[PDB]
Enzyme design. Structure first.
Site, PDB file in Angstrom:
ATOM      1  N   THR A 126      44.968  19.247  56.489  1.00 54.30           N
ATOM      2  CA  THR A 126      45.272  20.650  56.789  1.00 54.30           C
ATOM      3  C   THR A 126      45.473  21.533  55.559  1.00 54.30           C
TER       4      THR A 126
ATOM      5  N   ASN B 151      47.969  16.154  51.844  1.00 51.30           N
ATOM      6  CA  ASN B 151      49.200  16.611  52.485  1.00 51.30           C
ATOM      7  C   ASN B 151      50.445  16.064  51.789  1.00 51.30           C
TER       8      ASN B 151
ATOM      9  N   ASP C 271      28.525  12.438  33.159  1.00 45.89           N
ATOM     10  CA  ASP C 271      29.796  13.056  33.500  1.00 45.89           C
ATOM     11  C   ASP C 271      30.933  12.072  33.208  1.00 45.89           C
TER      12      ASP C 271
ATOM     13  N   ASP D  51      45.308  20.716  67.063  1.00 39.87           N
ATOM     14  CA  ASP D  51      45.670  19.568  66.243  1.00 39.87           C
ATOM     15  C   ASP D  51      46.915  18.798  66.738  1.00 39.87           C
TER      16      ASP D  51
ATOM     17  N   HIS E 278      42.831  12.618  61.265  1.00 43.24           N
ATOM     18  CA  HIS E 278      41.718  13.220  60.475  1.00 43.24           C
ATOM     19  C   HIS E 278      42.057  12.976  59.015  1.00 43.24           C
TER      20      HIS E 278
ATOM     21  N   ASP F  16      34.419  15.698  35.712  1.00 40.88           N
ATOM     22  CA  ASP F  16      34.832  17.035  36.121  1.00 40.88           C
ATOM     23  C   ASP F  16      33.736  17.763  36.937  1.00 40.88           C
TER      24      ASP F  16
ATOM     25  N   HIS G 272      39.504  21.479  60.082  1.00 43.16           N
ATOM     26  CA  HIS G 272      38.942  20.126  60.148  1.00 43.16           C
ATOM     27  C   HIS G 272      38.922  19.719  61.630  1.00 43.16           C
TER      28      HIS G 272
HETATM   29  C1  LIG Z   1      34.986  25.039  40.684  1.00 46.65           C
HETATM   30  O1  LIG Z   1      35.282  26.347  40.255  1.00 46.65           O
HETATM   31  C2  LIG Z   1      36.328  26.462  39.319  1.00 46.65           C
HETATM   32  C3  LIG Z   1      36.637  27.928  39.027  1.00 46.65           C
HETATM   33  O2  LIG Z   1      35.518  28.510  38.376  1.00 46.65           O
HETATM   34  C4  LIG Z   1      35.988  25.675  38.029  1.00 46.65           C
HETATM   35  O3  LIG Z   1      37.253  25.422  37.446  1.00 46.65           O
HETATM   36  C5  LIG Z   1      37.354  26.036  36.164  1.00 46.65           C
HETATM   37  O4  LIG Z   1      36.648  25.261  35.220  1.00 46.65           O
HETATM   38  C6  LIG Z   1      36.657  25.737  33.884  1.00 46.65           C
HETATM   39  C7  LIG Z   1      35.987  24.680  32.995  1.00 46.65           C
HETATM   40  O5  LIG Z   1      36.658  23.423  33.144  1.00 46.65           O
HETATM   41  C8  LIG Z   1      38.104  25.977  33.407  1.00 46.65           C
HETATM   42  O6  LIG Z   1      38.058  26.615  32.135  1.00 46.65           O
HETATM   43  C9  LIG Z   1      39.145  26.138  31.276  1.00 46.65           C
HETATM   44  O7  LIG Z   1      40.306  26.957  31.453  1.00 46.65           O
HETATM   45  C10 LIG Z   1      41.419  26.798  30.573  1.00 46.65           C
HETATM   46  C11 LIG Z   1      42.432  27.895  30.911  1.00 46.65           C
HETATM   47  O8  LIG Z   1      42.816  27.600  32.235  1.00 46.65           O
HETATM   48  C12 LIG Z   1      44.001  28.270  32.715  1.00 46.65           C
HETATM   49  O9  LIG Z   1      43.759  29.605  33.143  1.00 46.65           O
HETATM   50  C13 LIG Z   1      42.887  29.729  34.274  1.00 46.65           C
HETATM   51  C14 LIG Z   1      42.549  31.201  34.553  1.00 46.65           C
HETATM   52  O10 LIG Z   1      43.634  31.882  35.159  1.00 46.65           O
HETATM   53  C15 LIG Z   1      43.500  28.998  35.482  1.00 46.65           C
HETATM   54  O11 LIG Z   1      42.676  29.110  36.625  1.00 46.65           O
HETATM   55  C16 LIG Z   1      43.758  27.522  35.150  1.00 46.65           C
HETATM   56  O12 LIG Z   1      44.340  26.863  36.276  1.00 46.65           O
HETATM   57  C17 LIG Z   1      44.185  25.420  36.207  1.00 46.65           C
HETATM   58  O13 LIG Z   1      45.309  24.758  35.636  1.00 46.65           O
HETATM   59  C18 LIG Z   1      46.529  24.855  36.373  1.00 46.65           C
HETATM   60  C19 LIG Z   1      47.513  23.864  35.773  1.00 46.65           C
HETATM   61  O14 LIG Z   1      47.765  24.283  34.457  1.00 46.65           O
HETATM   62  C20 LIG Z   1      46.404  24.556  37.877  1.00 46.65           C
HETATM   63  O15 LIG Z   1      47.479  25.122  38.597  1.00 46.65           O
HETATM   64  C21 LIG Z   1      45.105  25.042  38.519  1.00 46.65           C
HETATM   65  O16 LIG Z   1      45.005  24.367  39.764  1.00 46.65           O
HETATM   66  C22 LIG Z   1      43.905  24.792  37.582  1.00 46.65           C
HETATM   67  O17 LIG Z   1      43.750  23.389  37.396  1.00 46.65           O
HETATM   68  C23 LIG Z   1      42.390  22.886  37.417  1.00 46.65           C
HETATM   69  O18 LIG Z   1      41.630  23.109  36.224  1.00 46.65           O
HETATM   70  C24 LIG Z   1      42.108  22.473  35.034  1.00 46.65           C
HETATM   71  C25 LIG Z   1      41.257  22.869  33.821  1.00 46.65           C
HETATM   72  O19 LIG Z   1      41.497  24.215  33.460  1.00 46.65           O
HETATM   73  C26 LIG Z   1      42.142  20.953  35.237  1.00 46.65           C
HETATM   74  O20 LIG Z   1      42.710  20.319  34.102  1.00 46.65           O
HETATM   75  C27 LIG Z   1      42.903  20.584  36.521  1.00 46.65           C
HETATM   76  O21 LIG Z   1      42.686  19.236  36.835  1.00 46.65           O
HETATM   77  C28 LIG Z   1      42.444  21.387  37.737  1.00 46.65           C
HETATM   78  O22 LIG Z   1      41.169  20.923  38.110  1.00 46.65           O
HETATM   79  C29 LIG Z   1      44.599  27.429  33.861  1.00 46.65           C
HETATM   80  O23 LIG Z   1      45.924  27.835  34.139  1.00 46.65           O
HETATM   81  C30 LIG Z   1      40.996  26.832  29.100  1.00 46.65           C
HETATM   82  O24 LIG Z   1      42.109  26.497  28.304  1.00 46.65           O
HETATM   83  C31 LIG Z   1      39.834  25.870  28.805  1.00 46.65           C
HETATM   84  O25 LIG Z   1      39.405  26.068  27.456  1.00 46.65           O
HETATM   85  C32 LIG Z   1      39.237  24.860  26.652  1.00 46.65           C
HETATM   86  O26 LIG Z   1      37.952  24.262  26.783  1.00 46.65           O
HETATM   87  C33 LIG Z   1      36.910  25.152  26.364  1.00 46.65           C
HETATM   88  C34 LIG Z   1      35.515  24.689  26.803  1.00 46.65           C
HETATM   89  O27 LIG Z   1      34.650  25.811  26.813  1.00 46.65           O
HETATM   90  C35 LIG Z   1      36.986  25.452  24.861  1.00 46.65           C
HETATM   91  O28 LIG Z   1      36.015  26.405  24.482  1.00 46.65           O
HETATM   92  C36 LIG Z   1      38.363  26.010  24.524  1.00 46.65           C
HETATM   93  O29 LIG Z   1      38.487  26.023  23.121  1.00 46.65           O
HETATM   94  C37 LIG Z   1      39.471  25.152  25.150  1.00 46.65           C
HETATM   95  O30 LIG Z   1      39.510  23.947  24.405  1.00 46.65           O
HETATM   96  C38 LIG Z   1      40.797  23.787  23.784  1.00 46.65           C
HETATM   97  O31 LIG Z   1      41.727  23.207  24.684  1.00 46.65           O
HETATM   98  C39 LIG Z   1      41.305  21.934  25.137  1.00 46.65           C
HETATM   99  C40 LIG Z   1      42.097  21.510  26.374  1.00 46.65           C
HETATM  100  O32 LIG Z   1      43.469  21.780  26.191  1.00 46.65           O
HETATM  101  C41 LIG Z   1      41.403  20.969  23.952  1.00 46.65           C
HETATM  102  O33 LIG Z   1      40.957  19.683  24.311  1.00 46.65           O
HETATM  103  C42 LIG Z   1      40.531  21.449  22.787  1.00 46.65           C
HETATM  104  O34 LIG Z   1      40.830  20.642  21.663  1.00 46.65           O
HETATM  105  C43 LIG Z   1      40.646  22.962  22.495  1.00 46.65           C
HETATM  106  O35 LIG Z   1      41.716  23.261  21.618  1.00 46.65           O
HETATM  107  C44 LIG Z   1      38.682  26.095  29.809  1.00 46.65           C
HETATM  108  O36 LIG Z   1      38.017  27.319  29.546  1.00 46.65           O
HETATM  109  C45 LIG Z   1      38.985  26.727  34.440  1.00 46.65           C
HETATM  110  O37 LIG Z   1      40.359  26.692  34.103  1.00 46.65           O
HETATM  111  C46 LIG Z   1      38.850  26.125  35.835  1.00 46.65           C
HETATM  112  N1  LIG Z   1      39.542  26.965  36.812  1.00 46.65           N
HETATM  113  C47 LIG Z   1      40.158  26.484  37.904  1.00 46.65           C
HETATM  114  C48 LIG Z   1      40.836  27.463  38.852  1.00 46.65           C
HETATM  115  O38 LIG Z   1      40.178  25.277  38.170  1.00 46.65           O
HETATM  116  C49 LIG Z   1      35.338  24.325  38.301  1.00 46.65           C
HETATM  117  O39 LIG Z   1      34.648  23.842  37.153  1.00 46.65           O
HETATM  118  C50 LIG Z   1      34.359  24.348  39.499  1.00 46.65           C
HETATM  119  N2  LIG Z   1      33.865  23.029  39.821  1.00 46.65           N
HETATM  120  C51 LIG Z   1      32.552  22.704  39.819  1.00 46.65           C
HETATM  121  C52 LIG Z   1      32.177  21.286  40.159  1.00 46.65           C
HETATM  122  O40 LIG Z   1      31.644  23.507  39.557  1.00 46.65           O
HETATM  123  C1  LIG Z   2      41.964  31.807  56.558  1.00 48.71           C
HETATM  124  C2  LIG Z   2      43.220  31.145  56.030  1.00 48.71           C
HETATM  125  N1  LIG Z   2      44.239  30.875  56.740  1.00 48.71           N
HETATM  126  C3  LIG Z   2      45.294  30.301  56.124  1.00 48.71           C
HETATM  127  C4  LIG Z   2      46.496  29.894  56.699  1.00 48.71           C
HETATM  128  C5  LIG Z   2      47.467  29.321  55.923  1.00 48.71           C
HETATM  129  O1  LIG Z   2      48.641  28.955  56.527  1.00 48.71           O
HETATM  130  C6  LIG Z   2      48.668  28.975  57.959  1.00 48.71           C
HETATM  131  C7  LIG Z   2      49.983  28.427  58.449  1.00 48.71           C
HETATM  132  N2  LIG Z   2      50.934  29.146  58.986  1.00 48.71           N
HETATM  133  N3  LIG Z   2      51.979  28.277  59.303  1.00 48.71           N
HETATM  134  C8  LIG Z   2      51.616  27.036  58.932  1.00 48.71           C
HETATM  135  O2  LIG Z   2      52.277  26.038  59.062  1.00 48.71           O
HETATM  136  N4  LIG Z   2      50.383  27.100  58.394  1.00 48.71           N
HETATM  137  C9  LIG Z   2      49.630  25.947  57.871  1.00 48.71           C
HETATM  138  C10 LIG Z   2      47.260  29.127  54.560  1.00 48.71           C
HETATM  139  C11 LIG Z   2      48.358  28.495  53.766  1.00 48.71           C
HETATM  140  C12 LIG Z   2      48.357  26.970  53.660  1.00 48.71           C
HETATM  141  C13 LIG Z   2      47.995  27.829  52.438  1.00 48.71           C
HETATM  142  C14 LIG Z   2      46.063  29.492  53.969  1.00 48.71           C
HETATM  143  C15 LIG Z   2      45.084  30.090  54.767  1.00 48.71           C
HETATM  144  S1  LIG Z   2      43.469  30.697  54.406  1.00 48.71           S
HETATM  145 CA   LIG Z   3      31.666  16.432  32.500  1.00 46.77          CA
HETATM  146 CL   LIG Z   4      47.071  13.042  51.930  1.00 46.40          CL
HETATM  147 ZN   LIG Z   5      46.672  17.020  61.952  1.00 42.80          ZN
END
Ligand SMILES: *[C@@H]1O[C@H](CO)[C@@H](O[C@@H]2O[C@H](CO)[C@@H](O[C@@H]3O[C@H](CO[C@H]4O[C@H](CO)[C@@H](O)[C@H](O[C@H]5O[C@H](CO)[C@@H](O)[C@H](O)[C@@H]5O[C@H]5O[C@H](CO)[C@@H](O)[C@H](O)[C@@H]5O)[C@@H]4O)[C@@H](O)[C@H](O[C@H]4O[C@H](CO)[C@@H](O)[C@H](O)[C@@H]4O[C@H]4O[C@H](CO)[C@@H](O)[C@H](O)[C@@H]4O)[C@@H]3O)[C@H](O)[C@H]2NC(C)=O)[C@H](O)[C@H]1NC(C)=O
Ligand SMILES: Cc1nc2cc(OCc3n[nH]c(=O)n3C)c(C3CC3)cc2s1
Ligand SMILES: [Ca+2]
Ligand SMILES: [Cl-]
Ligand SMILES: [Zn+2]
Ligand SMILES: [K+]
Ligand code: NA
EC number: 3.1.4.39
Length: 806
Positions: free
Chosen positions: A159, A180, A683, A261, A420, A687, A309
């Site tokens: 969910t 979850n 890869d 559900d 599920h 990632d 789902h």
């Molecule tokens: C699906 O779509 C998404 C969205 O487009 C894609 O995900 C993006 O991928 C990008 C490439 O990996 C990535 O870009 C990096 O961002 C870093 C900054 O990130 C922060 O800010 C953003 C913007 O607001 C934010 O969204 C991020 O949020 C992540 O992290 C927090 C936790 O801190 C989480 O709450 C959140 O869920 C999210 O986590 C996810 O992404 C991170 C990676 O960012 C993963 O580690 C997690 O597992 C999770 O999946 C952040 O808050 C930035 O710092 C990076 O820059 C480094 O690398 C570049 C390469 O170009 C380099 O040029 C820079 O110099 C830098 O390197 C330096 O730092 C390195 C690491 O510390 C170090 O090793 C080196 O030595 C260097 O000094 C990078 O640009 C982007 O953040 C994510 N965005 C999201 C939302 O996930 C994804 O790829 C798509 N998937 C597919 C299959 O296509």
């Molecule tokens: C179209 C969308 N609907 C929803 C609905 C959501 O939450 C719906 C919700 N209300 N009360 C409760 O128990 N749930 C799970 C959420 C929150 C879980 C993040 C994201 C989205 S995106």
């Molecule tokens: Ca890779």
């Molecule tokens: Cl789970």
């Molecule tokens: Zn359920």
């Protein structure tokens, strides 16, 4: 501490939340134990119920009533939803003929059609057909609007991961809600359904629709409803919000139902007790639509009806127990159920070895109902690995089954009959999508699509720019009457070289041999033409792929195939060839068995070498264009070029050889010709994105030849299979895969048998979207077709699932 001594008077379901110890009157206060003392009295009124009756008509307003039947209620915006029906002779929305909504028909002061998202928990895709007799409001939405036969959820099909993917357009690995239940080792904190930690903002990554809207000046109603607010009140609150003044009225709204559900868990997806929950959901939709009609909004609002789902039959007796496989069972923590995730119970335990846990769980019982994986070996289509919250060891569970650690966990914690969480290609996990309104199409069916695509469309519907996400923006343009998003093809970053003959045989010292010195202006001019690209129109049907990163590569032409050859990775990034229905399979002649031939267009310095393979006792090689499918004995020499060679484990060659010798011809027979593009994928950091050169963890011993983590193939033909693949006038048909390049076949429990008994089953598990392959290679395919770009984006997001009909 919340000093709950303030008042909710005039504040009920306030859109802007206040900071405690001011008490709260928004629909989340209940979840936080922070409501004002008079919240129930003022905001959760129930007096007289939810429906007008003949005697209530024209009544004197009584502010105690749940909803109103007085003359003033329409302007006030708080009538019971059946008011005009009961008191003013109106028909229910469900009883009106449907009529195309060509343009939004909105009250003056509306700047954009509002969007209402009606999400239903556990709503399996087959309920739309199977429940149709008892859901007439839903059936009208479905038949009069735009609908898919089903919508693919994300893995795991739980969910929270799915609702948050709906909100963000992100894979769970990116948004952070990977189940979850979760442990984050960096926070050293746990996330659970029960409790308060799940409200901490650190769990929730990306940018959900409500924040996207707010930041761009579009106001949003609530998405998360407290479980204790009844459905009728949620509907009336939305209707009330829609009656606010222009400057206060939200443009986006969400309603959520815990059903079907909640019942499906207790009774199974099709238990006879399931009829009533579906009836109740339909009645709620009816209340919304009647309400919208009263406010003259029923031809103004865009409505989405969407599930998170589906639901499968699962009972206690179908449980596999890790205690039946592991002796060390108390040294591990299992996240249990319809998926498994294992980690060490204690990080101080240096005796803990994931490798020996995997081995003890691999192919141990004849009908074993789960399969163990290191997370990086999971099918790439699941996009389930790049998060520290996903444990290195994963168990993929068969549909209808559970996994648990020990039998005591199951009878000390049969109740349930449905669950599920399984693989997101499983038919029973599939869910629903209907869009209805001025911006959606009229009476239109669209192909199945993935829920990761909806965020972009909701942004389109609200005129918002979407945050970066995993949808492919444009791929759902065929859902929409207007507001389409018109993307441009990405610009090519590296242009290719086209090398001619530049090296003499003797310059190569690669340790390679070929029995090829067995030697005319007819066929010497002819072979020169082929090397200049004379047959390229036949083997490169949709143009060459564009390289979207900076690199050094060469186009190599041949009679039977064309490749883009990387000087950096020393092998093709892609190899393209067409196999007609009539093509014939031949064998590798005896004299050519170990033949590898220098490519005189490509420097020894940019070439693989045979000695490395000899020296590497683990690593062998295969070919990207198969020698078996050469067009003539003379053309066959091209397939043995060192530039067509790639590194392959002997265990993997069994897979690859069966694909190339048997399956390609089979697909060409069934599909009337196929075009195939194959290549390597690197890869190493799992990632889902193309690795740079400095990320490669394994090389062919003693060399700079990098070892692919995966091999892909994209297999395209004409959707109208009466036309041959190379002479197709309309839409295309694709299937693709990303096979893991593994040194054993442990994944396949039947691998000691003939490839005909296990290879195809492996490939089906590793089915892929062209889009998945694009992320993984930095290539862009189908650049030159006669089709619209949006149609090609849809084609690139297609997944061939191999499931039976829904
Ligand atoms: C699906 O779509 C998404 C969205 O487009 C894609 O995900 C993006 O991928 C990008 C490439 O990996 C990535 O870009 C990096 O961002 C870093 C900054 O990130 C922060 O800010 C953003 C913007 O607001 C934010 O969204 C991020 O949020 C992540 O992290 C927090 C936790 O801190 C989480 O709450 C959140 O869920 C999210 O986590 C996810 O992404 C991170 C990676 O960012 C993963 O580690 C997690 O597992 C999770 O999946 C952040 O808050 C930035 O710092 C990076 O820059 C480094 O690398 C570049 C390469 O170009 C380099 O040029 C820079 O110099 C830098 O390197 C330096 O730092 C390195 C690491 O510390 C170090 O090793 C080196 O030595 C260097 O000094 C990078 O640009 C982007 O953040 C994510 N965005 C999201 C939302 O996930 C994804 O790829 C798509 N998937 C597919 C299959 O296509
Ligand atoms: C179209 C969308 N609907 C929803 C609905 C959501 O939450 C719906 C919700 N209300 N009360 C409760 O128990 N749930 C799970 C959420 C929150 C879980 C993040 C994201 C989205 S995106
Ligand atoms: Ca890779
Ligand atoms: Cl789970
Ligand atoms: Zn359920
Ligand atoms: K070898
Ligand atoms: Na095996």
């Amino acid at each position: 501490w919340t000093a709950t001594s303030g008042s909710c008077k005039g504040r009920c379901f306030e859109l802007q939340e206040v900071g405690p110890p001011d008490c709260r009157c928004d629909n989340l206060c209940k979840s936080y134990s922070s409501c004002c003392h008079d919240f129930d009295e003022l905001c959760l009124k129930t007096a007289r119920g939810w429906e007008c009756t003949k005697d209530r008509c024209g009544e004197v307003r009584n502010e105690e009533n749940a909803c109103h039947c007085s003359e003033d209620c329409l302007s006030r915006g708080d009538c019971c939803t059946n008011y005009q029906v009961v008191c003013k002779g109106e028909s229910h929305w469900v009883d009106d003929d449907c009529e195309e909504i060509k343009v939004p028909e909105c009250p003056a002061g509306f700047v954009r059609p509002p969007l209402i998202i009606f999400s239903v928990d556990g709503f399996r895709a087959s309920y739309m057909k199977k429940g149709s007799k008892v859901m007439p409001n839903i059936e009208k939405l479905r038949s009069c609007g735009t609908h898919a036969p089903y919508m693919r959820p994300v893995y795991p099909t739980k969910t929270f991961p799915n609702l948050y993917t709906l909100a963000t357009g992100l894979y769970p690995e990116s948004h952070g809600i990977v189940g979850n239940s979760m442990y984050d080792p960096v926070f050293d904190a746990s996330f659970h359904l029960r409790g308060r930690e799940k409200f901490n903002h650190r769990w929730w990554g990306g940018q959900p629709l409500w924040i996207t809207a707010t930041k761009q000046g579009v106001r949003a109603g609530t998405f998360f409803w407290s479980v204790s607010i009844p459905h009728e009140r949620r509907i009336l609150t939305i209707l009330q919000w829609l009656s606010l003044p222009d400057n206060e009225r939200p443009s986006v709204y969400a309603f959520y139902s815990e059903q079907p559900d909640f019942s499906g868990h207790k009774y199974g997806p099709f238990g006879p007790e399931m009829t009533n929950p579906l009836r109740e959901i339909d009645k709620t939709v009816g209340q919304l639509m009647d309400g919208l009609k009263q406010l003259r909004l029923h031809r103004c609002v865009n409505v989405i009806f969407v599930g998170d789902h589906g639901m499968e039959d699962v009972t206690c007796d179908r449980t596999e127990f890790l205690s039946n496989y592991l002796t060390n069972v108390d040294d591990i923590t299992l996240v249990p159920g319809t998926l498994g995730r294992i980690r060490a119970k204690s990080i101080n335990n240096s005796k803990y070895d994931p490798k020996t846990i995997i081995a003890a769980l691999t192919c141990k019982k004849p009908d074993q109902h789960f399969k163990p994986y290191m997370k990086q070996h999971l099918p790439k289509r699941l996009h389930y690995a790049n998060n520290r919250r996903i444990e290195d060891i994963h168990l993929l569970v068969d549909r209808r089954w559970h996994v648990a650690r020990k039998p005591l966990d199951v009878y000390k914690k049969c109740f349930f009959q449905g669950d599920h969480g399984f693989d997101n290609k499983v038919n029973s996990m599939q869910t629903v999508f209907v869009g209805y309104g001025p911006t959606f199409k009229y009476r239109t069916k669209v192909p199945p699509f993935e829920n990761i695509e909806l965020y972009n469309v909701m942004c389109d519907l609200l005129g918002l720019k979407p945050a970066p996400n995993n949808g492919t923006h444009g791929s759902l343009n065929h859902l929409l009457r207007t507001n389409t998003f018109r993307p441009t093809m990405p610009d090519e970053v590296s242009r290719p070289n086209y090398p001619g003959i530049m090296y003499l045989q003797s310059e190569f010292d690669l340790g390679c041999t070929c029995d090829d010195k067995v030697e005319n202006k007819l066929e010497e001019l002819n072979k020169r033409l082929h090397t200049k690209g004379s047959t390229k129109e036949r083997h490169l049907l949709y143009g060459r792929p564009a390289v979207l990163y900076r690199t050094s590569y060469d186009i190599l032409y041949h009679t039977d195939f064309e490749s883009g050859y990387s000087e950096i990775f020393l092998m093709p990034l892609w190899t393209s060839y067409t196999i007609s229905k009539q093509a014939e399979v031949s064998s590798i002649p005896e004299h050519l068995t170990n033949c590898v031939r220098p490519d005189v267009r490509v420097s020894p310095g940019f070439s693989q070498n045979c000695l490395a393979y000899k020296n590497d006792k683990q690593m062998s090689y295969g070919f990207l264009f198969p020698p078996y499918l050469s067009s003539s004995p003379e053309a066959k020499y091209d397939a043995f070029l060192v530039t067509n060679m790639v590194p392959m484990y002997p265990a993997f060659k069994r897979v690859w050889a069966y694909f190339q010798r048997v399956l390609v011809k089979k697909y060409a027979s069934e599909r009337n010709g196929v075009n195939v593009i194959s290549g390597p994928i690197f890869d190493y950091n799992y990632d889902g994105l193309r690795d740079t050169e400095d990320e490669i963890k394994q090389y062919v011993e003693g060399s700079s030849i990098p070892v692919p983590t995966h091999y892909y193939s994209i297999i395209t033909s004409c959707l109208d299979f009466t036309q041959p693949a190379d002479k197709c006038d309309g839409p295309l048909s694709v299937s693709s895969f990303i096979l893991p390049h593994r040194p054993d076949n442990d994944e396949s429990c039947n691998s000691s048998e003939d490839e005909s008994k296990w290879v195809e089953e492996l490939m089906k598990m590793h089915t892929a979207r062209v889009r998945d392959i694009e992320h993984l290679t930095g290539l862009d395919f189908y650049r030159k077709t006669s089709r619209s770009y949006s149609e090609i984006l849809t084609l690139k997001t297609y997944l061939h699932t191999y499931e039976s009909e829904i």
